[model samples]
Target: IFKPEELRQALMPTLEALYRQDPESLPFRQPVDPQLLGIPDYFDIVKNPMDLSTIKRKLDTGQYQEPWQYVDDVWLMFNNAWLYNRKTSRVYKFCSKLAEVFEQEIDPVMQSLG
Candidate 1:
């Protein structure tokens, strides 16, 4: 298994490269819009009809920013911890333990991040 810091270091360059690409070319690189609400409602309406591909296309085109957008908070917190702190090894250990408890919830997220 990859240590969190190691995994983060490995992926940062690729993520930065994606960010450097034309904003139009990157589907998930949109600027977050925090004013939006009704995420569950919107999901209920669109998901039941299986319209996610259309919704994703709209998001890619900047017609709408997704209503659910907290992943950046985790990314920023982990980035700050890695960059400014000297205890990344300990942090990664703690994260590993935390993952054991919450892995069911977070495993998919980690996979998606990768």
Candidate 2:
């Protein structure tokens, strides 16, 4: 019987720690601004865009009912990068690294929750 607070308590610090991992010069910390990034077609390709800030807000508001739901959003954030950027692009590379970081960081939390 997992309480909602159990998942929230585990997620908040993990997310905050991940936020700090985002590159200061990059766009990972906020929502994707298609117009600012010159990718108006981004929304067209990324139907379910997700970001750290959005995830944090959702978590704070109890929008997440399970740990995997939060994990899915984080995965979607990285998946959107893979979908939008060129394979050899700088953003793509950062996305790769962050994906690795996220997997490593989240695996144990998921295991504990399960």
Q: How close to the true structure is residue 86 of candidate 1, measured as C-alpha lDDT? A: 50
Give me the candidate number with maximum lDDT: 2
Writing each residue's lDDT as its tens digit, candidate 1 over 1-114 gives 444454444334333433343432232234222236423443332222211233334334444232222234333433433443255466444433332333344445456655
lDDT score at residue 21, model 2, on the 0-100 scale: 67
lDDT of prediction 2: 0.82
Q: Estimate each model's TM-score.
A: 0.27, 0.88
* 95 Cα displacement, candidate 1 (Å): 31
Candidates' lDDT values, in order? 0.36, 0.82
Our model 1 lands, by Cα RMSD against the true structure, at: 17.3
Instruction: Give the runs in model 2 whose Cα sits over 4 Å from its true position.
Output: 22-25
Q: Which tens-of-lDDT digit does each residue in 23-70 have in candidate 2?
A: 731568778888987878989999998888889888888889888899
